[PDB]
Design a protein around this ligand. Structure first.
Ligand SMILES: CCCCCCCCCCCCC(=O)O
Length: 133
């Protein structure tokens, strides 16, 4: 049941995103721009296939996947990873693997807001998105 995640979402709060980016090795100038960017995330489904778009003034990404089926992904910061997205506890959990490393991108709904928790190494970032009409 992915349906309450679907729609267009705008970033309205960010905590520790610089720590997360730095853990991934993102360079200072990119982190600087990213710290001032408010992406729009669009999540849509067509049958079993989800498409997740991230749009900003800096950098755009798009992925399509089936829940529970691995896919190749090239992230915004140009990591080539093996990914899987699943529902776990009502949360949409995206796991990326590369070079023996892992990062998780966990989405959940709290009071109608989309909370994205990003973990890599010891870095834990929390970003909050609110839905666009
Ligand atoms: C080139 C710009 C790279 C910026 C850092 C990207 C890190 C991985 C993706 C983070 C996604 C955050 C979000 O969807 O709010």
């Amino acid at each position: 049941m992915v349906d309450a995640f679907l729609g267009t979402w705008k970033l309205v709060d960010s905590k520790n995103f610089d720590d997360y980016m730095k853990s991934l090795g993102v360079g200072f100038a990119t982190r600087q721009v990213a710290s001032m960017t408010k992406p729009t995330t669009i999540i849509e489904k067509n049958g079993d296939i989800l498409t997740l778009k991230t749009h900003s003034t800096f950098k755009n990404t798009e992925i399509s996947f089936k829940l529970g089926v691995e896919f190749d992904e090239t992230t915004a910061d140009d990591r080539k990873v093996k990914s899987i997205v699943t529902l776990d506890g009502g949360k949409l959990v995206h796991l990326q693997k590369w070079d023996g490393q892992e990062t998780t991108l966990v989405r959940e709904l709290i009071d109608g807001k989309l909370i994205l928790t990003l973990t890599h190494g010891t870095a834990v970032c929390t970003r909050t998105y609110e839905k666009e009409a």
